[PDB]
């Protein structure tokens, strides 16, 4: 569980928001890109894996699952690339709910920045610090630390 | 403190590499930018603070210390902005040594990517996973987890 991440792609203002969620904690990382390509997805995973111990990634769709560039980045970074098929049917709605919540937070900060990418990073901050009573940021560190010890 | 980070700026291939180092662990995050502006530095800190519990940032120079954009981002993110003056004289050489090591790693991966930004992220990965026997990635998580508990 502590090394499992899920990729997610959502759209806003004619742009793409690429999201990685740490499944056990709800912690997220996100970036804005013009469009979802293998190359952008590969780069995003390289960034992620340098920052957290990414063991397994459930890809967000078949194109990223198939992409040789993505497969190469996963090989390079020591990541097991898997499908994101909701074998547990709960996963479709959970991703839906996350995107809705993320977009809500983005709406709450949107006027504090000119560029969407900035609003997205503010939303990542707010999401990861929100107390649920631990935050997602606290949960991910605790989960991984316990795994190391 | 577990919340203390140091900003660092170095140059390669006519571009700027902006680095944040977690002082207690040696863990790093980095990005390539065309040039170091207040705006780029502010954005980098917003990204960092959404991902790790950043309490204090020692800025890399007086322009970023002075920048109203940087000060605004620090206020927004709940970061105490401080100078980076080596009151301990050892800090100048330690940063120097880090940049030299980072550039060495970049050289070792440079031919595996077209774009410098990609090589920099590969170097971040290698640095953060390198054992010596825990890695920087392991140390940062352990330090912060202990702080939470
Ligand atoms: O509000 C949300 O649903 C939400 C989540 C939910 N999340 C978890 O806690 C565990 C998990 C696994 C897979 C997908 C999502 C989740 C996570 C991040 C969010 C959420 O709203 C905004 O950012
Ligand atoms: O060439 C780039 O800079 C680049 C790459 C390169 N690349 C692959 O095609 C497969 C791979 C595995 C590990 C590391 C790098 C690569 C991939 C994605 C990129 C690249 O520039 C921006 O986004
Ligand atoms: O406007 C942007 O998108 C942007 C900003 C905006 N900004 C400030 O000027 C001060 C501040 C504090 C907290 C959040 C945002 C801002 C800053 C940096 C940027 C921005 O676009 C890219 O880099
Ligand atoms: O080789 C390096 O010096 C290096 C460091 C050093 N580092 C720590 O271990 C603790 C610390 C506090 C303040 C500044 C630097 C450090 C860190 C990161 C690196 C280093 O080489 C490449 O990436």
UniProtKB/TrEMBL annotation, chains A, B:
<keyword id="KW-1188">Viral release from host cell</keyword>
<keyword id="KW-0378">Hydrolase</keyword>
<keyword id="KW-1043">Host membrane</keyword>
<dbReference type="GO" id="GO:0042025">
    <property type="term" value="C:host cell nucleus"/>
</dbReference>
<keyword id="KW-0238">DNA-binding</keyword>
<keyword id="KW-1179">Viral genome integration</keyword>
<dbReference type="GO" id="GO:0075523">
    <property type="term" value="P:viral translational frameshifting"/>
</dbReference>
<dbReference type="GO" id="GO:0003887">
    <property type="term" value="F:DNA-directed DNA polymerase activity"/>
</dbReference>
<dbReference type="GO" id="GO:0039657">
    <property type="term" value="P:symbiont-mediated suppression of host gene expression"/>
</dbReference>
<keyword id="KW-1048">Host nucleus</keyword>
<dbReference type="GO" id="GO:0043657">
    <property type="term" value="C:host cell"/>
</dbReference>
<keyword id="KW-0255">Endonuclease</keyword>
<keyword id="KW-0540">Nuclease</keyword>
<keyword id="KW-0863">Zinc-finger</keyword>
<dbReference type="GO" id="GO:0004533">
    <property type="term" value="F:exoribonuclease H activity"/>
</dbReference>
<keyword id="KW-1035">Host cytoplasm</keyword>
<keyword id="KW-0862">Zinc</keyword>
<keyword id="KW-0694">RNA-binding</keyword>
<dbReference type="GO" id="GO:0006310">
    <property type="term" value="P:DNA recombination"/>
</dbReference>
<keyword id="KW-0917">Virion maturation</keyword>
<dbReference type="GO" id="GO:0019013">
    <property type="term" value="C:viral nucleocapsid"/>
</dbReference>
<keyword id="KW-0449">Lipoprotein</keyword>
<dbReference type="GO" id="GO:0004190">
    <property type="term" value="F:aspartic-type endopeptidase activity"/>
</dbReference>
<feature type="domain" description="Integrase catalytic">
    <location>
        <begin position="1"/>
        <end position="144"/>
    </location>
</feature>
<keyword id="KW-1032">Host cell membrane</keyword>
<keyword id="KW-1193">Eukaryotic host translation shutoff by virus</keyword>
<keyword id="KW-0167">Capsid protein</keyword>
<protein>
    <recommendedName>
        <fullName>Gag-Pol polyprotein</fullName>
    </recommendedName>
</protein>
<keyword id="KW-0677">Repeat</keyword>
<keyword id="KW-0519">Myristate</keyword>
<dbReference type="GO" id="GO:0035613">
    <property type="term" value="F:RNA stem-loop binding"/>
</dbReference>
<keyword id="KW-0229">DNA integration</keyword>
<keyword id="KW-1163">Viral penetration into host nucleus</keyword>
<keyword id="KW-0479">Metal-binding</keyword>
<keyword id="KW-0543">Viral nucleoprotein</keyword>
<keyword id="KW-0233">DNA recombination</keyword>
<dbReference type="GO" id="GO:0006508">
    <property type="term" value="P:proteolysis"/>
</dbReference>
<keyword id="KW-1190">Host gene expression shutoff by virus</keyword>
<keyword id="KW-0472">Membrane</keyword>
<dbReference type="GO" id="GO:0075713">
    <property type="term" value="P:establishment of integrated proviral latency"/>
</dbReference>
<keyword id="KW-0548">Nucleotidyltransferase</keyword>
<dbReference type="GO" id="GO:0003964">
    <property type="term" value="F:RNA-directed DNA polymerase activity"/>
</dbReference>
């Amino acid at each position: 569980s502590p090394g499992i991440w899920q990729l997610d792609c959502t759209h806003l203002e004619g742009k793409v928001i690429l999201v990685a969620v740490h499944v056990a904690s709800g912690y997220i990382e996100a970036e804005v890109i013009p469009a979802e390509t293998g190359q952008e997805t590969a780069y995003f995973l390289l960034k992620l894996a340098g920052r957290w111990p990414v063991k397994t990634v459930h890809t967000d769709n078949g194109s990223n699952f198939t992409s040789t560039t993505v497969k190469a980045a996963c090989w390079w970074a020591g990541i097991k690339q898997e499908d994101g098929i909701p074998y547990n049917p709960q996963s479709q709605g959970v991703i839906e709910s996350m995107n809705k919540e993320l977009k809500k937070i983005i709406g709450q900060v949107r006027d504090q920045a000119e560029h969407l990418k900035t609003a997205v990073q503010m939303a990542v901050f707010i999401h990861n610090h929100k107390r649920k009573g631990y935050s997602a940021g606290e949960r991910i560190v605790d989960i991984i630390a316990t795994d190391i010890q």
